[PDB]
């Protein structure tokens, strides 16, 4: 509960996936360090949308292989993301890739009428990110470092 990095990471990732899936912006205010969270979500819309467009075939290929139909499938994706994401090197390129693939899957979840799985997917991505890359994120100045890196 006393973990600002986790709270802010979940807020950003949750909002991006939800707005990617529904096409609607969330109007609830951002709690603590609102400006940073706003700018981060703003950066994701530019860079994340970019990754999904530029790498559509690779994302569609991966989604087809994973065959997501339900909550059990979304649960097993987290195991995949740990192996895939956590075993490789650490940088904002791969972090945006992970979150962008998150958003790609979220749109699929809306397509197949499994919207209830989007919040659990966002929490699973947040947990992989902040659990496996804590020390890297803190050293990089967290979401302020993310905003500055993609300016
Ligand atoms: C679970 C899917 C995931 S999460 C994930 N998180 C971070 N990085 C990833 N990939 C980048 C390479 C990359 C870059 C852009 C588009 C595609 C790949 C990296 O490892 O450096 C992946 C992948 C992923 C891995 C391998 C093939 C893939 N094809 C579709 C997604 C995907």
Swiss-Prot record:
Motif (BH1): 83-103
Protein name: Induced myeloid leukemia cell differentiation protein Mcl-1
Alphabetized UniProt keyword annotations: Apoptosis, Cytoplasm, Developmental protein, Differentiation, Isopeptide bond, Membrane, Mitochondrion, Nucleus, Phosphoprotein, Transmembrane, Transmembrane helix, Ubl conjugation
Family: Belongs to the Bcl-2 family.
Functional note: Involved in the regulation of apoptosis versus cell survival, and in the maintenance of viability but not of proliferation. Mediates its effects by interactions with a number of other regulators of apoptosis. Isoform 1 inhibits apoptosis. Isoform 2 promotes apoptosis.
Assembly and interaction partners: Interacts with HIF3A (via C-terminus domain). Interacts with BAD, BOK, BIK and BMF. Interacts with PMAIP1. Interacts with BBC3. Isoform 1 interacts with BAX, BAK1 and TPT1. Heterodimer of isoform 1 and isoform 2. Homodimers of isoform 1 or isoform 2 are not detected. Isoform 2 does not interact with pro-apoptotic BCL2-related proteins. Interacts with RTL10/BOP. Interacts with BCL2L11; may sequester BCL2L11 to prevent its pro-apoptotic activity. Interacts with GIMAP5 and HSPA8/HSC70; the interaction between HSPA8 and MCL1 is impaired in the absence of GIMAP5.
Keyword Cell membrane among UniProt keywords: no
Ranges spanned by the short sequence motif BH2, renumbered to the chain: 135-150
Chief localisation class: membrane
Lineage: Eukaryota, Metazoa, Chordata, Craniata, Vertebrata
Domain of life, per lineage: Eukaryota
Cross-link (Glycyl lysine isopeptide (Lys-Gly) (interchain with G-Cter in ubiquitin)): 25, 28
Induction profile: Expression increases early during phorbol ester-induced differentiation along the monocyte/macrophage pathway in myeloid leukemia cell line ML-1. Rapidly up-regulated by CSF2 in ML-1 cells. Up-regulated by heat shock-induced differentiation. Expression increases early during retinoic acid-induced differentiation.
UniProt modification remark: Cleaved by CASP3 during apoptosis.
Shown residues in whole-protein numbering: 171 to 320 of 350
GO-annotated molecular function: BH3 domain binding; channel activity; protein heterodimerization activity; protein transmembrane transporter activity
Gene giving rise to this polypeptide: MCL1
